[PDB]
Design a protein around this ligand. Structure first.
Ligand code: NA
Ligand code: NA
Ligand code: NA
Ligand code: NA
Lengths: 497, 497, 497, 497
């Protein structure tokens, strides 16, 4: 059975990234199920720490740890065992009374705060990886389009000539700052609240630093109230998601306008477009609109979380709203889809240049040339050239057909006086490629300037990747240390006690 | 005429910080009027830069700069001159045609982006100063209350014994992280978009680094589209405001519950309370509720800004929602008010201790003692001690009157068996001060632990202040350099040309 | 295996309504799966209409309709067949090419708009039924508590004496207006967009009124653009959910404060409370906090939907955010839970009355009595009685122990003059039950007044139920007509053609 | 001094409606100042009621009422007297102690709730009047464009041929439903909470019905808690504003796309457009983008209000967020601006028709014609005609140049078989005006159908106006009765007592 939506102009299959936008809702885990594996790791880390501290014997510890593996397997097909007291009860049914001792010095409150942090931590690295992939596609695309002349818009009106490369590096700069937001967040997420217990710590002699290290955290949430009451990192995670996706929505919208029947300066790759069940001419930007949809929806968790924090005291509270897996899954789907849209986008270079040459985006350079050549002030030059445009539109004269006579008449009609410039001066001013070449400062569209930005972006991308590799490795190392510690205890008890 | 609201139990005058909550709405500037002085500085910096670059002669530059001072004075009492084209026109009426030349290589788009950044930058430093003041009050208060025993709550139910000092250091830790959020934001706000012009830069040979330096920026918004399209810093500013204020709302709510007629464990200072026009017994938490009001309202700009970004393309757009002065003014009023509330709050130490001793928050330590002394698992100890509470509540026995007989009977009723602990063991477990002393790990309420946190917080506060002083000085130095540069040009032209 | 969370003070089982709060997230359908059955009904209604209009033969129609039943059964265990083109393709594989003809004069756009309306319509009736159940519990509770004297709060400070019955009728009045909001919404939801096709209707001679009637709609979305572009009803549904739940959050919060260890004027039934895994004394308001959680989360869809509408044109768009099943499911769970909380709530009548008698809520009546008896103006009486309170608090005198001497001394200390009232006058003023009896106007707490409100509410509840029964029956009748029509076509074709 | 922004292509003056968008922020009242006049009316109504009830003598009443006029004049230039206790104190300084008696049976709580309701009530009628004006412009415009053929869009892609008249009647249908939302709201806003006093009524024998009638209310907020705690009407007002404005944003966006340089199917009137300070070619949609800005910002109050309600108990609370004058002022400015945009919009009829004829929106009718003429199923016809489009785009053939040969070849290439239709059949199918004429059902673009909708809309507009006139007159009558009553008391006391 082929994909039934791939009919008419929707040729070939959906891109995998495009398909993700249709799968995440049904596939999403509940927060409870997403967090559960991390809770299991926390049980191991906590028990191991209690063993170092002499609160549990190695014998007790080995019995508990073997039990945890058994209950974990039970919970793999029984969701009802994925919350704490049901899990603890299953453990008790499995290994007996000693199961109760795993909760010494601990609460569901700091367990839950830690488990959710571990989940969000993982998802943050997942997100950073996706955003890096997005930025890579944007920067690589830009590098192929240093001389792809096109107009930039302001207020959805043609403004001045740029290049597609120049436009994409605006997106790269946006993404660089969002990557900073995410990395800044990570430092606050990756703190361990365990040892706070209910909210006030415990008389038991815990070593909070050990539990933290065994679970890959880079530090503690120190104060025990902050350990269970603290939730700002959840709000912040939802915020960075929302603001990052708003930038993604803006790009999606930009490309959607570019690929209208009327603009026609770009075309989506077929693998990122759909069609209509009734209108056979449609090549629809379903990838773009579903990506925007995700962006809009990301507003929801942000507001829900902040509302819930505004509504309570500085306490542990079961009333706090969560950042849920399905929300993060939508972000990843949209980010992947837009990565693919950007990679495979088909610019219509000839039409791009035609608009740049014909629809008056070159008028600023005409105005600048008057100021530079004849020394009149910018406001008067502007009024002259505005008159040129008004007359050209009235007479049906494209910008690249404007010559000396039209500019003279406009000058006279507008100021009573002619103006002392040549036909060659005007011709050069109205050449859209020369508009691009003139704009050669930092961050401007001239190829040498955009190329400088790309070189800088490539270096930053290397650091983005290095940061991600280091963060990921730190967690992998901790998880290996923990697994090794668990096996040491279980095997030594089995054979040598 | 005295303050007519200060009647009955509302004795004395409102604290100045309390009064701020009633004044900011009527006193708030429009964004246009708030940003205008920064636009004036930008005109000076831009003109000075054009002069270094040889785009303006020193003669032209001096004429413009003297004109700017004249129009600035006009605009001081004529709001209609506080937007760009009306201002430029007034300049032209003042010094003639050369006024038009100040706009060479520039747009309202990058002017506006820069001016708003300078406004928000200023407001951010204002905010950081206020938040530091808030944290100072919190930490200083905590230092006076290391042995002020009281219960902490979870889910608005008494949980365990802590101290007021311990509670306040949770707030300090919250504020430390919000100060990081704000400082992280500052680095993104303090980038100069000038030189982007409309959105694509300019053929004019600008030195973007000079303009940036003259206006106190620490770097550029490099890409010219990002220069005029970039708005995430506005969304981020609104977010940090919202999440910070949500923490302030939670403290306000906490104190409001503490100072209910039923809790009565704290009392607002009269200077932060009001009364009722009809009910003479009221001592109302108007300071707290108005502070929460500001927190709730801060949700509004955040949503409006993100909505507007989700709704457009990656372009300059006049449709973007702003962060307005009245919103920031509300934050400052609430932060100042809560600073004062915390400083002057009157704890009822005797009642705090009575609740800790009588209302069963000490039961966890009883449970821990059973586990520690007799080795039973935590879940069984918990069930025994829960039975103790159920029976004590049934019989009207306060926690500090629970003795050996009650614990034995509960143990037997619950498990069939007695339990082998002494009356002294039980007595020590149920002593709320000993509950506090037992909890002596990192971030826990024992005086030595909280004192460690305070020492750490005092060191961090010193760094908070150092950062603020350095940031402020950098702007003052730039503004002096600019003023000096303006006078050099004007005076040299006046006397020596 | 018993419910492992039911330990210690969490005695017995969770109430079923309480349990719902823990089940809805995992049990919730996707919008696609929730809407699918309605899409199947729409296929039948559309095909039947095409048959009346002579666009399909009875032979074609019977083949399609039998096919729909077959594909419906396939889709029951294959989610991939629950969107339109995959479903249509399965139909084509089942009955052949004629399957394609069911889409004549139709689009996914008006199909989707109609199907979602039918889903939301159903959910709205579900919601109205739940809200009626909530109001019934509130009104029935009030009727049992006409003389249950207690204080009402303003700004979380004790204000004046009322009754629990009086308080609950405030909630009833709130719910009456929310039921109006929902019924008003229903009239806009229950309009049929089918026949709009893509957005501009069709040349095919449809009878839009037939399709509408067969699907239980009470009218058309007339204009074809509005048919596919219209989405305000979705935003409105999300809004009424949010504002209704905000009232539910406020009640939950009220009861949570009432049931604090410090207030102790009410106690949750055990079946609506949980306990702590570590603190054995806890009787936690999990039902209340999870209900508030749902209220907060309802903010999310509202913002997401409105953002998406603000971001597009007045067109069909795949970017619009939806109101999803899990959101409505949360509302229903919270509404059911709070229905049960209210029904089973245990007031502490003795403590309620003690607070009313002792904590100065009776001071307004003392003030009123001075004005009435001696004719002084309200502001001066107020200042005298405020002084009475200040002195009584200083001296540790409860309100019901305030006598003539204290009032005289306060009067003198405050105005220089005594005041001419008797000890009996004062005693009557400070009697909290007499405070209640004096307040006998419309909407006031006197038993005869609250009883009048209850009688009115019972009559309104009868009309609420009548409206619901009528709306439900109308849909049942339409669905029966449709099923009958389908069988007529299939059987007549089978036997008689 | 002319408007300095009116340069270049920004010819003539701004339309007054356009200018409103630039004035409302600076001109907006504070809520306190907006509500104050209504509070003054409430003092009069309350005092008059107390006089009927014999609580005040006519002598006392006349002294107070004359005093109110005096303090009102003081407050006209002294904002500090616009809140209650300062006002009451000024009254006391003006007429002496008897001033205190105006507060008998009353609180700031029910005073404030009532005053805000009167303000919002007024603003609601203001809003309904503006929305009626908007709908009038839309419907009148549509009536002039019954044969103005143009394409409608879905997903920002050309869909099918309609008329501009047909499009505008979608907007009319939207506005009709928003007018229902507003009128439904009005019934809940126009209820009087006075007599609730603090929250529990009063022992004083008030006649709540008199006060209500004297202030133009159509009924009571009955329960006294609901009287001061009730706030849902504020949330609802903010919601209807937000959803109505989202529709306005969508129209603004639609017109903005229409008037892009690339679409060029409409042009804003110069009086609703601006230009650029740097780019002389710009004719900028400032009216549209500022209108959208208002729409986005309307999200803010809605979220702030609901957050505040979610955060408290069902009590009077000073923490509740308000709907403020500046927010409503923005709505009115945007509504007026868009009224003018619609009235003066310049369609480019020739280009509209050219797109309809050339860019393949007529393909659905080609597909329908195949089904109708040859009896093939819709899915196969669709695939054939999609192939026609693919080939036509490949070969550079506009839709109105597609003939029999191209359709045959597509049919063969796609199915192996030709198809039995004539050149005349194809020609008629591809004629965009005939596409419009074929679509002649309810709500479809055929002139006779749109004309029917206009006739219906004109009748509804008449009822909209009648409702508004009746509501307005009811308030004017009440205000006259009140003024007459005040003068009767003052003059009878002056001359006859
Ligand atoms: Na960076
Ligand atoms: Na820090
Ligand atoms: Na009603
Ligand atoms: Na209507």
């Amino acid at each position: 059975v082929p994909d039934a939506t791939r009919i008419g102009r929707a040729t070939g299959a959906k891109a995998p990234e495009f398909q993700e936008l249709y799968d995440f809702d049904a596939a999403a885990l509940t927060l409870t199920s997403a967090v559960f594996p991390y809770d299991s790791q926390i049980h191991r880390a906590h028990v191991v720490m209690l063993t170092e501290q002499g609160i549990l014997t190695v014998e007790e510890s080995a019995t508990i740890l073997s039990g945890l593996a058994q209950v974990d397997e039970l919970a793999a097909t029984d969701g009802s065992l994925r919350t704490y007291l049901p899990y603890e009860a299953a453990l008790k049914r499995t290994i007996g009374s000693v199961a109760g001792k795993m909760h010494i010095g601990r609460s569901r409150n700091d367990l839950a705060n830690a488990g959710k942090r571990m989940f969000l931590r993982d998802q943050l690295l997942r997100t950073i990886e996706a955003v890096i992939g997005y930025r890579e596609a944007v920067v690589h695309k830009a590098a192929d389009h240093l001389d792809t002349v096109m107009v930039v818009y302001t207020q959805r009106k043609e403004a001045q000539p740029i290049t597609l490369g120049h436009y994409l590096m605006a997106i790269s700069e946006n993404l660089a700052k969002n990557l900073d937001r995410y990395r800044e967040l990570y430092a606050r997420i990756n703190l361990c609240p365990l040892g706070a217990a209910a909210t006030a710590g415990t008389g038991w002699p815990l070593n909070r630093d050990r539990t933290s290290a065994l679970l890959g955290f880079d530090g503690l949430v120190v104060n025990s109230i902050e350990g269970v009451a603290g939730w700002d990192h959840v709000a912040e995670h939802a915020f960075v998601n929302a603001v990052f996706l708003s930038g993604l929505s803006r790009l999606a919208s930009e490309i959607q306008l570019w690929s209208t029947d009327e603009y026609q300066v770009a075309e989506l790759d077929a693998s990122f477009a759909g069609t209509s069940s009734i209108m056979p001419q449609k090549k629809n930007p379903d990838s773009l609109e579903r990506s925007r949809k995700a962006a809009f929806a990301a507003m929801g968790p942000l507001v829900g979380i902040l509302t819930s924090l505004n509504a309570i005291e500085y306490q542990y509270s079961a009333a706090r709203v969560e950042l849920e897996p399905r929300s993060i899954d939508a972000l990843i789907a949209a980010t992947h889809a837009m990565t693919g849209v950007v990679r495979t986008l088909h610019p219509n270079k000839e039409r791009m240049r035609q608009y740049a040459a014909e629809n008056y985006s070159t008028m600023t350079d005409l105005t600048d040339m008057l100021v530079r050549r004849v020394g009149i002030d910018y406001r008067e030059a502007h009024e002259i050239v505005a008159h040129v445009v008004i007359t050209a539109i009235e007479k049906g004269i494209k910008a690249n057909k404007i010559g000396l006579d039209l500019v003279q008449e406009a000058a006279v009609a507008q100021t009573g006086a002619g103006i002392n410039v040549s036909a060659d001066d005007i011709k050069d001013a109205l050449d859209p490629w020369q508009n691009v070449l003139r704009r050669e400062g930092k961050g401007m569209p001239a190829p040498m300037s955009v190329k400088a930005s790309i070189d800088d972006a490539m270096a930053e991308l290397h650091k983005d990747r290095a940061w991600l590799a280091n963060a990921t490795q730190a967690l992998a190392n901790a998880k290996q240390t923990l697994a090794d510690s668990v096996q040491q205890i279980i095997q030594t008890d089995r054979k040598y006690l």
